[PDB]
């Protein structure tokens, strides 16, 4: 008899200023009922959204997670939580008769935002190549995989979270190990497959208010 | 709820079906645009090109 949707109000979700489209969408939550207050029911919600509705002309096979850390009245401010690729991209690039090399590393930034980076690469068939198997040897794989994680340890350890997350809207990490590996075995589909968040540095309030500033 | 009962014209008949040679497939056109065309199944003698009536519009053809 009661309609619980008549007790619910709409907030709108905002992405940080690092992206072109600042407005993610609208969520809903029930109002305050004593100890059930209407803010902790939507702190820590994940919004699995892609780039192409968060940039203007960027790719669509990549998606960002965006936890909520603060509520500003009718607004619902967010911070970065992680990324991965879609399923259909990540299994369109796993084909036969090529080597899949994959690396992973735990690197924290200088802001205290410990990440786990996941990167893949696939060996590349050459243009004049006649034989079928474009396989790598095993000691080639070990030194490529050493070369992958050494580079993304550079690109994350040195500076803060904003320049890190800004590097992988164009995915210049996958393009930097693209150039640095093709004197070992050439690679072609080299992405950062997934970024996972391990830590958060106690949530200073003004750091989120910087991200939604200019 | 109420779908508009849509009269429909058949193009090429796709041969018999129905495990006894009793039903045939017609791939109607929808009498508003021949660009918009779905595959359907009817029973009885068909005579290629004519017009038949759909009490329901789009569910499924003979397809597992």
């Amino acid at each position: 008899v009661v309609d619980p949707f008549s007790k619910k109000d709409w907030y709108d979700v905002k992405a940080p200023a690092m992206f072109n489209i600042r407005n993610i969408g609208k969520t809903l939550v029930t109002r305050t009922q004593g100890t059930k207050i209407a803010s902790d029911g939507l702190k820590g919600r994940v919004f699995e959204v892609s780039l192409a509705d968060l940039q203007n002309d960027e790719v669509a096979f990549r998606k960002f997670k965006l936890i909520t850390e603060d509520v500003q009245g009718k607004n619902c401010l967010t911070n970065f939580h992680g990324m991965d690729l879609t399923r259909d991209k990540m299994c369109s690039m796993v084909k036969k008769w090529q080597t899949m090399i994959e690396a992973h590393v735990d690197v924290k930034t200088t802001d205290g935002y410990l990440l786990r980076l996941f990167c893949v690469g696939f060996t590349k068939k050459r243009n004049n190549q006649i034989r079928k198997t474009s396989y790598a040897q095993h000691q080639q794989v070990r030194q490529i995989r050493k070369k992958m994680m050494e580079i993304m340890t550079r690109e994350v350890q040195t500076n803060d979270l904003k320049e890190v997350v800004n590097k992988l809207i164009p995915d210049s990490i996958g393009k930097d190990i693209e150039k640095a590996c093709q004197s070992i075995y050439p690679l072609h589909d080299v992405f950062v497959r997934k970024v996972k968040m391990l830590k958060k540095p106690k949530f200073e309030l003004g750091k989120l208010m910087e991200l939604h500033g200019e | 709820r109420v779908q508009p009962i849509k009269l429909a014209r058949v193009t090429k008949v796709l041969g018999r079906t129905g495990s006894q040679g009793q039903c045939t497939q017609v791939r109607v056109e929808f009498m508003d645009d021949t660009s918009r065309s779905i595959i359907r199944n009817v029973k009885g003698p068909v005579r290629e090109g004519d017009v038949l009536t759909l009490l329901e519009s789009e569910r499924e053809a003979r397809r597992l």
């Binding site: 949707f5 993610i24 969408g25 609208k26 969520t27 939507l42 919004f47 | 789009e58 499924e60």
Partner: protein, 137 residues
């Protein structure tokens, strides 16, 4: 007019529609952009009384119409798709109600954004419930 968000005359607000099209049943659960707040979960096995036909394409066809009629009436007007198969240990292709609950979700006046298959895939994890010789039928 007490229900509904604040939009313009042209724009639309996004929700996601989790399709769980296994065999034996089908789910056409719609929820918000974070997935936490359920808007409407209606099922193909709640509008037929036959128990063969819960995985039928036809029961999914009218479950998709019923979930659109609730979603559009509440103010949430465009859908993203997160179709599942059974996944995990079990089969990884979706059942017969998969496509029909998707097309009839769109034929009954509703927009569609990004779609994705989001079924559970293991990394070579766990045994299957069949026996070594499988099930023999």
């Amino acid at each position: 007019i007490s229900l509904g968000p604040q939009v313009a005359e042209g724009e639309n607000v996004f929700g996601v529609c989790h399709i769980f099209a296994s065999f034996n049943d089908t789910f056409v659960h719609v929820t918000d952009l974070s997935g936490k707040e359920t808007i409407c979960r209606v099922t193909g096995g709640m509008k037929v009384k036959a128990d063969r036909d819960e995985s039928s394409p036809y029961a999914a066809m009218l479950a998709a119409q019923d979930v659109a009629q609730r979603c559009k009436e509440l103010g949430i007007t465009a859908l993203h798709i997160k179709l599942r198969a059974t996944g995990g240990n079990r089969t990884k292709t979706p059942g017969p109600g998969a496509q029909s609950a998707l097309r009839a979700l769109a034929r009954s006046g509703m927009k569609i954004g990004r779609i994705e298959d989001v079924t559970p895939i293991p990394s070579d994890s766990t045994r299957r419930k069949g026996g070594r010789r499988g099930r023999r039928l």
